[PDB]
Subunit: 300 residues, 4 copies
């Protein structure tokens, strides 16, 4: 298996003014991602509001990404839902698409209470797309707080198509144990963009995140600086990352990140309820503060 490298964007699902999926904007985001140096996409995940879409919408969205990317990006589709019936309907559909892997986030209502229980849930899902890899997505936001090192070690026995897990957590001690589980066999992309050089320094080889939708060249420059050992340059580039994150924290991560796509000529619309929309004034503020953060390049 080849572990992912570089930046994996978790794209938005653009909604038009009637809160319907805007498929033409999905086409424009894919071209943008390819031009800005992203290597893969994780679709219908948290940033993608996949759980805000119906099964029918999710199936059309995953097909739209596969057509829009024209084989130039690795594609991972998140198929998780609270109902195993919906999840299995999405996962079976995903096994028919030209994609790299499926994935499921920890269920957030009845939360798996042990590693063994979580392994059984993931094994049922991964078996419905046995031709594709399978990533567990460890979320924090899910409330599923189980030992991920043990998850990889136990799931290795039970899930034949296991790829590894996406680590959306700041716990670098657990992350480094995951990197080493089963002699380093599994692929463990890191998922906290504002911690990126910290994860690089302890062994991350790829990162999945939402800011890569609009700041990928800037983060690729952090990766290159870190690699060259230019730690001064990593530091000054993270100053612009911290100003970006501040906009997300003030205005909402999905909402502000959607508006930030205007910096690349993309109209991603508002989020869906229960996420709230920004006002017309707030949208102008988001774009002005993202410009002031100074991470944009006038090129690809």
């Amino acid at each position: 298996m080849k572990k992912l490298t570089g930046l994996i964007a978790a794209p938005h699902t653009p909604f038009d003014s009637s809160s319907n999926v805007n498929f033409e904007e999905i086409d424009k985001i894919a071209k943008h991602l390819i031009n800005d140096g992203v290597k893969g996409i994780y679709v219908c995940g948290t940033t993608g509001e996949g759980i805000h879409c119906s099964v029918e919408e999710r199936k059309a969205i995953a097909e739209r990404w596969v057509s829009a990317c024209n084989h130039k990006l690795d594609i991972i589709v998140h198929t998780g839902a609270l109902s195993i019936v919906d999840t299995l309907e999405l996962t079976r559909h995903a096994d028919t698409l030209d994609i790299l892997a499926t994935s499921a986030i920890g269920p957030c209502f009845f939360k798996p209470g042990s590693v063994s229980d979580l392994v059984e849930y993931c094994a049922t899902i991964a078996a419905a797309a046995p031709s594709k890899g399978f990533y567990y997505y460890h979320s924090g936001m899910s409330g599923v707080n189980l030992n991920m090192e043990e998850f990889l070690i136990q799931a290795d026995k039970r899930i034949p198509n296991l790829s590894g897990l996406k680590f959306n957590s700041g716990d670098l001690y657990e992350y480094q144990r995951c990197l080493r589980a089963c002699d380093g066999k599994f692929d463990v992309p890191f998922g906290v963009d504002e911690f990126l050089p910290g994860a690089l320094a302890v062994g991350a080889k790829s990162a999945v995140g939402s800011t890569y939708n609009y700041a990928a060249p800037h983060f690729n420059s952090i990766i290159e600086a870190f690699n060259k050992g230019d730690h001064d340059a990593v530091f000054n580039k993270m100053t612009n990352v911290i100003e970006l994150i501040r906009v997300l924290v003030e205005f909402g991560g999905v909402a502000a990140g959607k508006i930030a796509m205007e910096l690349h000529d993309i109209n991603a619309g508002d989020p869906r309820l229960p996420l709230m929309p920004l006002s017309a004034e707030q949208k102008l503020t988001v774009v002005e503060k993202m410009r002031a953060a100074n991470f944009l390049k006038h090129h690809h």
Copy 2:
């Protein structure tokens, strides 16, 4: 408006050995509930595993309850889902049925961050079933930890069909503030069965819960004792309730509660993933310990 009185069961969704909905067992549970002195049902809620079912299954389940109850019970249908599209499809369907009210539990992934935001989400839902009442279901398990007194006061302005909220929380200080919000206008059924006499004592008039599926006569006897001021009798009856709850805590609330339906000749099957099934040995243990708890009556 007439506030609910007495016990409102949150019924299970029985699954057969292929994990499909068992509609004939729904018929048998409804007859049982009516015979055991339940006054209403809250369907497709947490105990009902509504979020484990697809939209199509949920619509068939709600119709099956309305046919099976033959107008003898008040029916509240929980229509909440993580996708507002699914929620609105269920809520519109529910507005066509002969039921009392719809309801939605706090979304557990992106959690409403203020009372105002939660009021906007509930107002969008309640407007899709404007002919029926609407209860918010306050869950704890949802992770949506906002001031429910303020929710009622703010939602009163914004939701014309607001009935009140179901209070699945042990916070009796917040519960009593809810009972009094807007001069006592709203209906606030209590939702923690093992605290029942405590909520009675501070003003509860009805309770919604899962143990009422199989212990309703016993809890109706607590209500009658409390009413008569026989606090000794309340105490000795709660000793049997505590032995019941211990079985739920040891073996899982949905799983053990489903097996307990065998005490009334009902085969409710296993839960769905991510909830795990009990072994054949554990199912025999659940039934023996529920018998030993001594809350069953050999009559209706």
Copy 3:
């Protein structure tokens, strides 16, 4: 053993304008408590800011209460501190006083990680005052979240002078299991004043709390109403309790409760850092809102 009955106040430690202990005001509070129908006191606890005082101050405070009460109240002294050396110095001193029992709250920094560990810590403390009873104080605020039923069952074996535990938690399911542990052997006073009728209804015989410092006659009237089965009267009296609690939540429980002592001609001063003082305007507001809550009696 005779279980405590009625209201046990947790008195404040009055501080003068130099933040020194005001011993003469302790005398005035004791006379007040006896006149207002309190039956016991729990001194140097949370409301008492015992952990804000030095070992030397704490020893003088406990002696001042014993002199001021003139044998008319049962006295429990909280001797807990983060240092076992301080705790044991206080506990040994307390064994020499004419008091009913000592007590310790769960340590809040390194928190006992199992019931067994907590039993060993309490056994070491209770052995330093072997002539007096010993109550564990279960606090929530402590962060020590262990099964208190199991604590009583395990400590029964290990602590010869064990009296029971004071239950400052809203978990009525755990509270009722404590009431029944070892065939109902232990004394378990309830500790959430705004839940009082709820705990009465499930078996509480006494309650320890801070509002009893200034609202004892009103809560004694709730106890009498509940006993007579006058649930309407319990309800209308709890309306005044909820208006009292609102003042505590808005202005701080220790700070506002200290100012409320002005309603009984007592100058309890400000709290100590890290608790902040109220402004002169806020102190006038606290007293006006406590008057408006309408729980005061113009008599004893």
Copy 4:
């Protein structure tokens, strides 16, 4: 001001078999720390069990470190206690010693509820040792979860001897905002040893921690490798760090870390209650697993 550099050990307080302070072992630890390449010490902190010692013991301990270090290490004394009276008695004593700075951890029982409140508490403490620097110690274990960037910005106005804060938290996004607060003015040593290269990569210049008591040469080699950009070497050295941490998690951080001092001929004894002692078998296991982790050097 010169920011700290390199490793700052948080030493243990050795206890003999009567649970008294072993002052002669303090002498031996200081010589060891100086020989193993530590640059400073943070005494009477969490690893030091300072809160388990009385005020009188704490004063003798701080004096013993100052005599034992013979001016070869920078010394920071943690003076925090739950009672401001104890804290101020310790802080005034510390102002008389030849040390670099005092420090206080967030109080864990009544927790400061705003940045402003925490600034007022720290300002009162730092003013009692106005000749020494002052570090706030941000702990997580304290439960004091306030914005530390805002703490530095607000405290800059109010505390004339403010040095900065010790950051015992894995939140690298907050840590990098602290590094930059007030144009990078404050000294912010990092406090999570198992995350060290991650904090290096985002700008840490020093680290305070307990593993530096017995693994300082190994972590100094990580610092040197990271500096040279040898990320392969950082990775393989962190494999030995993860095996060390596993021993702490299995057997208790203070208890196992005390036993690990046997690897340097130091008898640090057991912790004090409420921390539990290891059995004779467990102590042999701790030393065997710390040897197997392979981070020890047969030299200084």
